[PDB]
């Protein structure tokens, strides 16, 4: 009877999920609200995480302690990094990673600032397991959960559903050259602000995880933020969760 945990950061990313729940009970602890109910008769907890890595990790940890979920779906909006993708396309996270983690080598003031020399700082994703250090350069989406979403692609009617790499950072990048550099360096499909942080906590608790993100925008094609994409993503995720539940 362990629930599916479904996450979104902002109100617009969870209200459709919350409306789908039957026999809802609301719980707020600290800054974080949860709605506990059922989908297709099976326990589901919807979590509004608030925004960014710290909020995502807090909200995920709190859900682990309170609800002991059997799997986590983290979803919401993202900005395009891959020029092949457009607003409305959905990325299923084959992996996510902390794209905002940076270490740089020593340079004197005279040499100025060059972000192209910065390195991904992997210690930010390092964990312990039974007390022993375990390195991580990314967090893989549970590959069966990833495959299921890809297999359901034709059920989403507002864009393509594709596998891709989710770059998580406390960032909203609109310098197109920076987006291009991040894509060329890390092969990112899209950027957002929670996935790898929630994924880190799910790895620590050994709970299967998948990130599902709709492109709400992409500056690679002059496509500005469309809030309706967040609703469409939740509709797909409800369908996805119901399919999982049909198999439980």
Report if residue 217 touches ligand ADE, rule: CB under 6 A: yes
Q: Could you tell me which of 4, 73, 5, 19 has the C-alpha nearest to residue 231?
A: 19
43 contacts 1 by C-beta, under 8 angstroms: yes
What gap in Å lies between CA 42 and CA 22, rounded to an integer?
A: 10
Q: Token pair 């250090």 is at which residue?
A: 133
Q: Which does 128 bind (CB under 5 to 8 A by kind): ligand ADE, a second copy, none?
A: a second copy
What gap in Å lies between CA 54 and CA 125, rounded to an integer?
A: 13
Q: Which does 244 bind (CB under 5 to 8 A by kind): ligand ADE, a second copy, none?
A: none
What gap in Å lies between CA 105 and CA 114, rounded to an integer?
A: 10
User: Which of 82, 192, 203, 223 contacts ligand ADE by CB under 6 A?
Assistant: 192
Q: How far is the CB of 186 from a second copy (least distance, A)?
A: 15
Report if residue 175 touches a second copy, rule: CB under 8 A: yes
Report if residue 49 touches ligand ADE, rule: CB under 6 A: no
CA dihedral 47, 51, 55, 56 (to 10 degrees): 60
What gap in Å lies between CA 218 and CA 234, rounded to an integer?
A: 19
What x/- string results for residues 8 through 37 when contact with a second copy is judged by CB under 8 A? Answer: --------------------x-xxxx----
Q: Give the C-alpha distances (Å, rounded to integers) separating 161 from 5, 88, 153.
A: 21, 9, 5
Residues 206-245 that bind a second copy (CB under 8 A): 219
- Return the DSSP state at 205: T
User: Which of 74, 77, 96, 197 contacts ligand ADE by CB under 6 A?
Assistant: 77
User: Which of 82, 191, 203, 223 contacts ligand ADE by CB under 6 A?
Assistant: 191
Binding site feature residues for S-adenosyl-L-homocysteine: 126, 172, 191, 193-194, 213, 217
**Contacting positions for a second copy (CB under 8 A):** 28, 30-33, 50-58, 60-62, 64-66, 98, 100-117, 121, 123-131, 169-178, 180-181, 193, 196-197, 200-201, 204-205, 219
């Amino acid at each position: 009877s362990a629930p599916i945990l479904i996450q979104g950061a902002m109100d617009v990313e969870v209200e459709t999920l919350v409306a789908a729940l039957k026999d809802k009970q609301e719980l707020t602890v600290g800054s974080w609200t949860y709605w506990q109910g059922t989908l297709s008769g099976y326990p589901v907890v919807v979590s509004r995480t608030e925004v960014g890595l710290a909020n995502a990790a807090a909200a995920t940890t709190l859900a682990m302690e309170r609800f002991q979920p059997r799997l986590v779906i983290n979803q919401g909006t993202a900005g395009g990094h891959d020029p092949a993708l457009h607003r409305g396309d959905i990325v299923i996270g084959t992996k996510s990673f902390n794209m905002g983690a940076y270490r740089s080598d020593l340079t004197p003031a005279e040499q100025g600032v060059d972000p192209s020399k910065w390195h991904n700082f992997e210690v930010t994703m390092r964990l312990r397991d039974n007390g022993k250090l375990v390195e991580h350069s990314s967090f893989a989406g549970d590959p069966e959960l990833v495959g299921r979403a890809l297999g359901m692609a034709d059920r989403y009617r507002h864009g393509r559903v594709v596998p891709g790499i989710i770059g998580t950072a406390d960032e909203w990048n609109r310098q197109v050259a920076r987006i291009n550099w991040l894509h060329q360096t890390y092969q990112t499909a899209a950027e957002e602000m929670e996935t790898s942080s929630a994924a880190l906590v799910a790895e620590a608790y050994k709970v299967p995880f998948v990130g599902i993100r709709v492109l709400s925008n992409t500056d690679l094609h002059g496509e500005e933020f469309d809030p309706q994409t967040a609703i469409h993503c939740q509709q797909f995720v409800i369908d996805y969760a119901k399919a999982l539940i049909n198999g439980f």
